[PDB]
UniProtKB/TrEMBL annotation, chain A:
Function per UniProt: May be involved in forming the receptor site for cardiac glycoside binding or may modulate the transport function of the sodium ATPase.
Protein name according to UniProt: FXYD domain-containing ion transport regulator
Transmembrane segments: 13-31
Organism: Sus scrofa
Subcellular location: Membrane
Subunit structure: Regulatory subunit of the sodium/potassium-transporting ATPase which is composed of a catalytic alpha subunit, an auxiliary non-catalytic beta subunit and an additional regulatory subunit.
Domain of life according to the entry: Eukaryota
Length: 32, 291, 291, 48, 97
């Protein structure tokens, strides 16, 4: 049915991006 | 403290007259530019949407169950004796049913007699304007039983024992799927499993359940379900003046001068419900006929 | 005074103490002073610009009786959620030029929040920022068949908690919670878009005079903040049940890039003005816009 | 801090006026005052 | 800040009743418009920023009892110092031979 979205997928997708994003600025700010 | 009106430098509101003009020009040009961008961006967005089908329909996946008399709080309270008390309620019924008379469906060209019994859902092509302006299935007020607005009670409607119908939210492309024969909760007030989507109403509250003993359902062909044949809806632009199927209920023995609650539940495979939306395929009402 | 070589009474009276007794601190002292003074101008501006898009929906919400484009909850996530981290980062910015070379400000002639700042943020950057937000707002609605032209005056029937037969221009019927779930879902990108534009406003407000590349993006705090801000926003929409606790629902991917151009346009506009300030020390660019 | 305070009290006062007039009004303006005031308290604690 | 806010709130308060809105709600807007206009997060931003700058002063043994005093040194136009102790080392010391 065209009235269903695999929200959980992009939901998890977003989670992943944000989690990854945090570690990146973290790496940057803790530059050594 | 507020003497910026004038100065030796001829500042108006603390500002020079010529420069005012210069600022005015900048703002005007700039603001026009932004709007010109904004509108142009919007024009794009217009062209990213089809004119026949919406791009996203996931939100309306659970259908809804509206009522004809839209009470400020789903509550009906009035005097049977007093016309004025129920006059306002009556008016709402009048407007909705106005576009349903046999006379209203004057043009045979745009009206198809679907039939006098439920029949196969009528798929009407792919949703494109390659075909023409598609056809609508009719619906006579006579189909409503003993709750006909313009017939037995043309202006009276119900002075006591009021009628109340439910309606399915008009939805593009919904293919209803009637429930299978074997459902444990299913109470078979009718045996029409093949071509009807049943709606049954119960008090929900035990106190209310006792309060109303019986209710009378009226359906096309004496069947208490939406006709599968009428659907699917093809869109307002594609199908102007499309008529939603109507199902009516008239309550029988009732408790007067008391408040009771009735829960109307649609059933079928393709129907969901939510404990946060009291109207998402479910239905509640508070009703009190005080004399 | 000098901590180890000074009278105790004088030290208490003094507003500043030197432990090492290195008189050189004064030099660093004024250096920081004139430096922090500027960076505050920068910092204050970033938050201020945000208010124009913050407030704007509320205004039109009354003017044209449309569904509310932005929730108060999200605003808090901007003023006090995302925006803060970049705002702190601004202070770390190094001096554009050697400040020690310039004269003391005059407390009458030069002020912290000048008239220019307002016109720059409230008048221009914020207004562009707001336009990006509305674009996204109109886009989402249309993409679910709620056409911009058709959204006028719709507020009244919209916010009613009982009218569940609202008609979209496509022609479908919607229940209260659904169309609310949409209004909430619509609110979330407005917030998101706000971060997208606040990207540009952050960069441009990193420098007053020199170009962006000229200053260089060596400020680690600023960089970490952008990622932190972005991550927070993203998480804010995709954590389990945010639409339950804070009434903020997930986002369909194409939404994220809704206003990337709007912000880019912002970045382009400020940079070209910075160049215009550079090329010519003429007053019109300076007096009107050099906050 | 004082200026923010005036807004908060103003938010708090606003909710009362709102509650009396409408029916079941949204707790938005109220929520605003609490956070606004809290900000000052937190700010004050840090400053002290 | 407030000066523009009142103007906006008042102007809206006018255009509110210009449209079919009652005094009862028109005030609610004027309050709300002025309210949401008020900056909120800025207070803690500025304060945190100020303390941070002082830290580096304290890193180099430059301390200030009053936090809001760091900016004053940069914003000065005239100075006056005491020759003894402040400028001198206040020690009789071998000068020239
Ligand atoms: C978009 C951002 C563009 C901004 C930019 O060019 O930034 C200046 C940058 O480059 C320095 O500035 C010099 C000034 O001439 C350049 O000649 C560079 O060769 C280099 O010495 O400094 C940052 C830290 O690495 C930033 O990431 C970028 O690398
Ligand atoms: C470096 C920056 C400025 C470039 C622009 C940021 C882009 C790459 C980031 C910022 C936020 C991100 C989005 C956050 C959430 C999701 C949900 C995920 O399931 C699909 C991708 C999507 C939609 C991401 C796409 C990439 C994205 C848009
Ligand atoms: C320099 C600037 C001003 C050029 C302007 C280009 C604009 C008008 C173009 C470039 C990229 C385009 C966007 C690309 C992505 C999407 C997602 C889509 O689902 C809605 C349209 C939208 C949002 C487009 C709108 C039109 C757009 C914004
Ligand atoms: C109907 O409403 O009216 C009839 C009188 O004309 C009556 O005999 C019949 O029982 C009624 N039926 C219902 C279902 O109300
Ligand atoms: C069309 C119809 O009535 N079909 C029913 C079927 O649903 C039911 O399961 C069966 C009982 O065994 O009896 C049949 O008559
Ligand atoms: Mg704000
Ligand atoms: Mg001395």
């Amino acid at each position: 049915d065209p009235f269903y979205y695999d929200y959980e997928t992009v939901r998890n997708g977003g989670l992943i991006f944000a989690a990854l994003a945090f570690i990146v600025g973290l790496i940057i700010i803790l530059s050594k | 403290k507020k003497f910026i009106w004038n100065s030796e430098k001829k500042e108006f509101l603390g500002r020079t007259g010529g420069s005012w003009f210069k600022i005015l020009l900048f703002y005007v040009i700039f603001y026009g530019c932004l709007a010109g961008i904004f509108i142009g961006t919007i024009q794009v967005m217009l062209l990213t949407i089809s004119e026949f089908k919406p791009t996203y329909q996931d939100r309306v996946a659970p259908p809804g169950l509206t009522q004809i008399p839209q009470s400020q709080k789903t509550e009906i309270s009035f005097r049977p004796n007093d016309p004025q008390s129920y006059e306002s309620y009556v008016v709402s019924i009048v407007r909705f049913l106005e576009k349903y008379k046999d006379l209203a469906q004057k043009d045979d060209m745009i009206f198809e007699d679907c039939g006098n019994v439920p029949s196969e859902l009528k798929e009407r092509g792919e949703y494109n304007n390659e075909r023409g302006e598609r056809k609508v299935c009719r619906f006579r007020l006579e189909w409503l039983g003993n709750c006909s607005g313009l017939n037995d009670e043309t202006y009276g409607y119900k002075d006591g024992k009021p009628c109340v119908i439910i309606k399915l939210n008009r939805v593009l492309g919904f293919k209803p799927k009637p429930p299978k024969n074997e459902s444990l909760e299913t109470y078979p007030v009718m045996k029409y499993n093949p071509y009807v989507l049943p709606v049954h109403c119960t008090g929900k509250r035990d106190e209310d359940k006792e309060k109303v003993g019986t209710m009378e359902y009226f359906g096309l062909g004496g069947y208490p379900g939406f006709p599968l044949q009428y659907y699917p809806y093809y869109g307002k632009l594609l199908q102007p003046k499309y008529l939603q199927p109507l199902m009516a209920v008239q309550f029988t023995n009732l408790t007067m001068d008391t408040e009771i609650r009735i829960e109307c539940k649609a059933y079928g495979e393709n129907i969901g419900y939510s404990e946060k939306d009291r109207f998402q395929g479910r239905f509640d009402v508070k009703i009190e006929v005080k004399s | 005074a000098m901590g180890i070589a000074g009278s105790d009474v004088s030290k208490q009276a003094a507003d500043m103490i030197l432990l090492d007794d290195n008189f050189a601190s004064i030099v660093t002292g004024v250096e920081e002073g004139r430096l922090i003074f500027d960076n505050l101008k920068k910092s204050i501006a970033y938050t201020l610009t945000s208010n124009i898009p913050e407030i704007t929906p509320f205004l039109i919400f009354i003017i044209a009786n449309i569904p509310l484009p932005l929730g108060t909850v999200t605003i808090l996530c901007i003023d006090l959620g995302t925006d803060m981290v970049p705002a702190i980062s601004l202070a770390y910015e190094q001096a554009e030029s050697d400040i020690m070379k310039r004269q003391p400000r005059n407390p009458k002639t030069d002020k912290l929040v000048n008239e220019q700042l307002i016109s720059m943020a409230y008048g221009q950057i914020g207004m562009i920022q707001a336009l990006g937000g509305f674009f996204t707002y109109f886009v989402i609605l249309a993409e679910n068949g709620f056409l911009p032209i058709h959204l006028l005056g719709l507020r009244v029937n919209w916010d009613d908690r009982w009218i569940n037969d609202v008609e979209d221009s496509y022609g479908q019927q919607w229940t209260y919670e659904q169309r609310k779930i949409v209004e909430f879902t619509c609110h979330t990108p407005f917030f998101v878009t706000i971060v997208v534009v606040q990207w540009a406003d952050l960069v441009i407000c990193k420098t007053r005079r020199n170009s962006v590349f000229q200053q260089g993006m060596k400020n680690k705090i600023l960089i970490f903040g952008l990622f932190e801000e972005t991550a927070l926003a993203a998480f804010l929409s995709y954590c389990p049940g945010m639409g339950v606790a804070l009434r903020m629902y997930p986002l369909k991917p194409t939404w994220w890039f809704c206003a990337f151009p709007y912000s880019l346009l912002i970045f382009v506009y400020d940079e070209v003005r910075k160049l215009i300030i550079r090329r010519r020390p003429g007053g019109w660019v300076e007096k009107e816009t050099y906050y | 801090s004082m200026l923010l305070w005036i807004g908060a009290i103003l938010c708090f006062l606003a909710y009362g006026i709102q509650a009396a007039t409408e029916e079941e009004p949204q707790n938005d303006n109220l929520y605003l005052g609490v956070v606004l005031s809290a900000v000052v308290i937190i700010t004050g604690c840090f400053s002290y | 800040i407030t000066g523009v806010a009142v103007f906006l709130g008042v102007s809206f308060f006018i255009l509110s009743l210009i449209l079919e809105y009652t005094w009862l709600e028109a005030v609610i807007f004027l309050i709300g418009i002025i309210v949401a206009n008020v900056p909120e997060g800025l207070l803690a931003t500025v304060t945190v920023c100020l303390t941070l700058t002082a830290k580096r002063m304290a890193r180099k043994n430059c301390l200030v009892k009053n936090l809001e005093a760091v900016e004053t040194l940069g914003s000065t136009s005239t100075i006056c110092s005491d020759k003894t102790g402040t400028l001198t080392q206040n020690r009789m010391t071998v000068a020239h031979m």
